[PDB]
Amino acid sequence: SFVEMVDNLRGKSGQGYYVEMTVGSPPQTLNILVDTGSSNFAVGAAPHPFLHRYYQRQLSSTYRDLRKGVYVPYTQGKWEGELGTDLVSIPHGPNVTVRANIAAITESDKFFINGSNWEGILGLAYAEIARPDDSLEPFFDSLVKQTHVPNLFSLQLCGAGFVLASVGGSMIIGGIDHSLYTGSLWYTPIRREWYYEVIIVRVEINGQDLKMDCKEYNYDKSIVDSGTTNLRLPKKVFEAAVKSIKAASSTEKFPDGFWLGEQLVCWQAGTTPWNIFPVISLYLMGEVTNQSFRITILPQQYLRPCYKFAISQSSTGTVMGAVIMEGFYVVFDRARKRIGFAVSACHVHDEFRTAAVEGPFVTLMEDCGY
Numbered sequence: 001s002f003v004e005m006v007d008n009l010r011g012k013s014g015q016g017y018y019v020e021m022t023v024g025s026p027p028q029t030l031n032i033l034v035d036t037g038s039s040n041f042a043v044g045a046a047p048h049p050f051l052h053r054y055y056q057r058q059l060s061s062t063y064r065d066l067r068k069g070v071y072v073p074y075t076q077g078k079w080e081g082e083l084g085t086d087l088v089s090i091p092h093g094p095n096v097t098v099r100a101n102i103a104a105i106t107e108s109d110k111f112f113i114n115g116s117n118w119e120g121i122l123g124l125a126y127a128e129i130a131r132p133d134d135s136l137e138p139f140f141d142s143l144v145k146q147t148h149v150p151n152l153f154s155l156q157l158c159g160a161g162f163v164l165a166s167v168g169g170s171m172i173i174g175g176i177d178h179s180l181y182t183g184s185l186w187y188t189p190i191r192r193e194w195y196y197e198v199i200i201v202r203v204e205i206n207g208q209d210l211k212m213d214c215k216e217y218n219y220d221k222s223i224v225d226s227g228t229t230n231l232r233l234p235k236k237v238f239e240a241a242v243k244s245i246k247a248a249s250s251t252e253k254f255p256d257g258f259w260l261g262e263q264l265v266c267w268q269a270g271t272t273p274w275n276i277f278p279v280i281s282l283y284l285m286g287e288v289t290n291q292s293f294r295i296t297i298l299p300q301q302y303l304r305p306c307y308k309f310a311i312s313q314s315s316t317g318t319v320m321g322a323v324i325m326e327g328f329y330v331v332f333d334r335a336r337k338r339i340g341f342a343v344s345a346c347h348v349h350d351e352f353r354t355a356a357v358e359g360p361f362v363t364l365m366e367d368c369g370y
């Protein structure tokens with residue numbers, strides 16, 4: 001039942017949403033980051049200063065070694081581990097147990113986050129981007145193959161709303177919970193099964209079209225990513241967007257470090273002038289040619305709580321992170337190669353504006369992919 005899965009996500013603002021999982025026999029409880037922008041199930045398996053708990057393979061009767069290492073360097077650090085399999089469950093998820101691949105992290109730097117309360121990562125994206133290669137079956141693929149769970153999951157990320165603020169939400173595995181959204185679910189095609197790749201066809205700031213070639217919005221790629229805090233935009237788009245937001249919020253201005261997402265800006269106890277900041281609409285490619293729909297977010301989404309500007313520049317394409325997802329109920333319909341969006345039952349809004357999902361809008365689109 002989906003009711004058992006409601007509110008199964010927790011986290012600290014800007015530090016990642018996690019779900020409780022167990023690994024091994026007897027079950028070892030760990031908190032695991034939900035990441036739709038990666039494809040490995042990887043868990044701390046050795047002491048680390050930021051780890052209060054870790055996976056202990058020697059304690060599991062059902063652990064099997066694959067005699068294979070994995071090494072993942074990136075700009076700023078790395079994680080390194082040993083591959084194996086073991087029994088895995090999600091206590092507040094489906095009532096099943098799966099033998100899944102596990103990367104046992106033995107060494108790392110700048111991977112784990114101080115105070116985040118998670119000990120591992122659940123990469124929910126596709127095999128193409130799994131490390132060390134695509135032969136390492138991702139967790140969700142194993143789950144679908146070994147059980148009768150439908151090939152679909154959904155995410156309701158709720159944020160904070162009124163120490164780092166606590167965030168919460170729900171991961172519904174194997175279906176759609178109608179109580180978690182209002183109005184209609186609109187679907188955009190998954191362009192290619194690697195990341196959850198999508199196509200943005202139009203973007204406006206307070207109803208004003210940025211008027212760019214739509215290739216620019218997907219310059220390199222556009223993805224839906226629970227593992228990213230910000231709405232990340234390609235250089236040309238970012239600059240165009242901040243110019244427009246600055247103009248709309250001209251009545252009293254802010255320092256440059258704010259717009260660079262580096263330094264905070266404060267008011268006091270419910271005095272925040274939300275109505276000065278514009279709404280942002282992303283138009284996504286629809287299921288039918290010449291047809292699109294829009295998702296509209298509020299400053300409450302893109303000003304992360306004192307606030308930091310949660311829109312930042314990207315060199316790797318558009319990343320629709322928590323900023324975008326927190327307005328909406330997001331369906332990752334893997335079976336039908338599409339991503340659904342609907343207004344979330346939990347999204348933060350005021351008495352003048354709301355997050356919105358609206359369509360259809362006609363856009364004449366196939367060549368917006370880069």
Ligand SMILES: CC(=O)c1ccc(Oc2ccc(-c3ccc(-c4ccccc4Cl)n3CC(=O)NC(=N)N)cc2)cc1
Binds near residue numbers: 015038074121322
């Ligand atoms: C607020 C919000 O929602 C939030 C905030 C902080 C978060 O913390 C982290 C922690 C570790 C990683 C990481 C290191 C190495 C990798 C990695 C890289 C290549 C292949 C496989 C992996 Cl595991 N990853 C995953 C990653 O790059 N994911 C993605 N870009 N979506 C990424 C993010 C997550 C979410």
